[PDB]
A paper describes a structure:
The bacterial metallo-β-lactamases (MBLs) catalyze the inactivation of β-lactam antibiotics. Class B members, known as the metallo-β-lactamases (MBLs), are structurally distinct from the Class A, C, and D enzymes, require one or two zinc ions for catalytic activity, and are not inhibited by currently approved therapeutics. One variant of significance is NDM-4, first identified in 2012 (17). Although it differs from NDM-1 by a single amino acid substitution, namely M154L, it demonstrates increased enzymatic activity against the carbapenems and several cephalosporins.
The first crystals of NDM-4 utilized in this investigation were grown at room temperature using poly(ethylene glycol) 3350 as the precipitant (pH 6.0). They belonged to the space group P21 with a monomer in the asymmetric unit. The model of the enzyme was refined to an overall R-factor of 17.9% at 1.3 Å resolution. The electron density for the polypeptide chain was continuous from Gly 42 to Arg 270. The two zincs that form the binuclear metal center are separated by 3.5 Å. Zn1 is ligated by the side chains of His 120, His 122, His 189 at the so-called “histidine” site and a bridging water (or hydroxide ion) in a distorted tetrahedral arrangement. The bond lengths between Zn1 and the imidazole nitrogens of His 120, His 122, and His 189 are 2.0, 2.1, and 2.0 Å, respectively, whereas the distance between Zn1 and the bridging water is 1.8 Å. Zn2 is surrounded in an octahedral coordination sphere provided by the side chains of Asp 124, Cys 208, His 250 at the so-called “cysteine” site, the bridging solvent and two water molecules. The metal-ligand distances are all ∼2 Å with the exception of that formed between the zinc ion and the thiolate of Cys 208, which is 2.5 Å.
Numbering used by the authors: 42 to 270
Amino acid sequence: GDQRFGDLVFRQLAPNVWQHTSYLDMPGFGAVASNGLIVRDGGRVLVVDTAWTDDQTAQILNWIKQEINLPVALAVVTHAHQDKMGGMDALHAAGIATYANALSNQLAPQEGLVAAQHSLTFAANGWVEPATAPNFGPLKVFYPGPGHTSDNITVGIDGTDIAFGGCLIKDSKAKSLGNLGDADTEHYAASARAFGAAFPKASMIVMSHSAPDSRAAITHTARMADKLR
Ligand SMILES: [Zn+2]
Ligand SMILES: [Zn+2]
């Protein structure tokens, strides 16, 4: 089901939901896939995460123009790393309103990234404060606690069986938790389990660096994270 578009890949997950995939070569290691989401909600499109680069992100918008041909109302980006926020300038050039965790916006400059235009904040239990996420339609944004990064956030899609763990969640057969350089090793396991508890009905778990999986991605990730503490 993978549709090639230039150097990117697009996969329809549900009637109005597509996964976007972009790649960054790393000498000595390999080309790393990063996944985000595209959601049609009525007469607009919503984006979750940029691609690694501005050019790649502009290609996502080109795909949306060709395949959906509706305005992109907003994007939400799920932490201040290159795979999630590397293409912010491309969104802004296109006139797209952008949203991120307040802390992501705070950290973005020092990470060599451009901040989103708008900051999300979260209730104590981790649900986004709804007034900070206007017009998010079916996107349900949840801060599961610090894990992959301190600022990592997650997104469920109402009307679907899909929840997006971003770089918090790895697939059920993953051999590691990837890049832990900015991780909270104490809180990771609890944060993974909190993601699963936030979206208990989601049967399709989408994530940054693996193809969509069953909820065994959550249990496996949490089990691996237990060993960090
Ligand atoms: Zn990351
Ligand atoms: Zn990542």
